[PDB]
């Protein structure tokens, strides 16, 4: 018996960040996360403003933002609050717990001070989560664990995926879901976000592999599609975002029955 | 048949950045990499200058450097040239090929412009290496693949480690070695760098596990020790670096018989 996003937002064990996300997904009829893989602050803010109404989440990539400052982040947060979407930073936390804590809080980027969500690879073992949560829990943040990857030759399969699920379900005070290609947890409190999404079949020239919104949401049971080039390379980015939103949303409704 | 670092520098298939490293290791009698996990440029540069003569490599951590600028990295290059050590940036590239390319070249940090070596996780598949290579190849950079991890619960074991070795073998134009706990390749062109090293037994409270220089160089067959807190937390970091250098160097000499 599958629950709607709005009902999942109310589950007793839901994490506050997941609840906030699920409520705005339901309100706005969007389960699309825009991957904003851009080099300029002006492009990031322009896309966030123009596409904000169509998205539940914006995945930032601050490591490639040539003119990052914390003032840009302040402005991005203003747009996120106005249009109602969460900010998910791309950075791949993937080190021992002692140093990921410093990477999350510190440096020039101060990721924990503006990202609602971050993601981590599980390869270090659960210390990666324990280190992140020492920063994320005081800042009321959530984390996604990379349980599967979309690229050719991915090693995030089999027992590796199972380890990611166990690590999430044992750190539910901080971990709110997964980056995955499919549903991997049977617990409805966890979110599933799927990159490697385009309307048409294909890939890229460096190992990316694409599946459609209907396949990943409808057949594979994921919750949210993450789309970069399928939107940003389109002539009309607003229309492209709307096409992806409508595709992902219908696929969700049809699985819901 | 074990070869000295100086002889390995002359191997037919050696990459130019590995040859440079192996030659300075032999010249200076050091197989120590300092893990400069500090948040201030002045401390980084003071450590690089004082410990430069004792190290073959300095592992930077720019994501935690609160006052990073490219001018700081210019001064680090000057010290690296003066004292003869390589610069290895910590950032754990762990994305699809198309995005890691941009992360390596771009943003504020412009890692490829100053780092001799970078490291990647192999979980995405070989596209991670191909994307980095598209930037680093003409710059005579090299990459290290994370084949094993030192932390409790590491998933970099078994077939995962074997996949890392195969990926390195198959990309030897750019991959010059491993982050590992032991020798994982039989090919002497490859470097093995081992973190999780301290003179004393123990660990940390976030899953780090330590082994001694004698164990990891002498018994486990690795080439270089990566040492952070064992040096950084000492009152006199120069004396500590010298203790680690002598331990790792004499363990290496023991192998040669
Ligand atoms: C963990 C993970 C991230 N991503 C990231 C890389 C890009 O920032 C984004 C996909 O962008 P794209 O839609 O332009 O291919 O998602 C994957 O594509 N696959 C994965 O498995
Ligand atoms: C890939 C990898 C990196 N590292 C990094 C994290 C730190 O920057 C450094 C170890 O620092 P430490 O000597 O203070 O524990 O090396 C590991 O400790 N283990 C690993 O397996």
Author numbering:
A (entry chain A), B (entry chain B): 223 to 479
What does the publication say?
Orotidine 5′-monophosphate decarboxylase (OMPDC) converts orotidine 5′-monophosphate (OMP) into uridine 5′-monophosphate (UMP) and CO2 during the final step of de novo pyrimidine synthesis, which is essential for producing DNA and RNA nucleotides. Recognized as one of the most efficient enzymes, OMPDC accelerates the decarboxylation rate by a factor of 1017, and exhibits a net transition-state stabilization (ΔG #) of 31 kcal/mol. Its unique ability lies in achieving this substantial enhancement without the aid of bioorganic cofactors or metal ions, relying solely on interactions between the substrate OMP and residues at the active site. However, the key catalytic amino acids at the active site are highly conserved, including two lysines (K281, K314) and two aspartic acids (D312, D317), which form the so-called catalytic tetrad in the sequence Asp317-Lys314-Asp312-Lys281 (numbering from the human enzyme).
Interestingly, the wild-type enzyme can also bind TMP, but with much lower affinity (K D = 119 ± 9 μM), which is 16 times weaker than its affinity for UMP. We then determined the X-ray crystal structure of wild-type OMPDC in complex with dTMP at a resolution of 1.05 Å, as shown in Figure . The phosphate gripper and pyrimidine loop surround dTMP, forming the same hydrogen bonds observed with the product UMP. The main differences are observed in the catalytic tetrad, which adopts multiple conformations, indicating high flexibility that may explain the lower binding affinity and possibly results from the absence of the 2′–OH group. Therefore, dTMP generally is not a suitable inhibitor for OMPDC, although the 5-methyl group is well stabilized by van der Waals interactions, as it points directly into the hydrophobic pocket formed by residues Met371, Ile368, and Ile401. Ligand binding stabilizes the enzyme’s closed conformation, while two major alternate conformations of the catalytic tetrad are visible, highlighting high flexibility. Interestingly, human OMPDC can bind dTMP. This suggests that the methyl group at C5 may compensate for the loss of binding energy provided by the 2′–OH group.
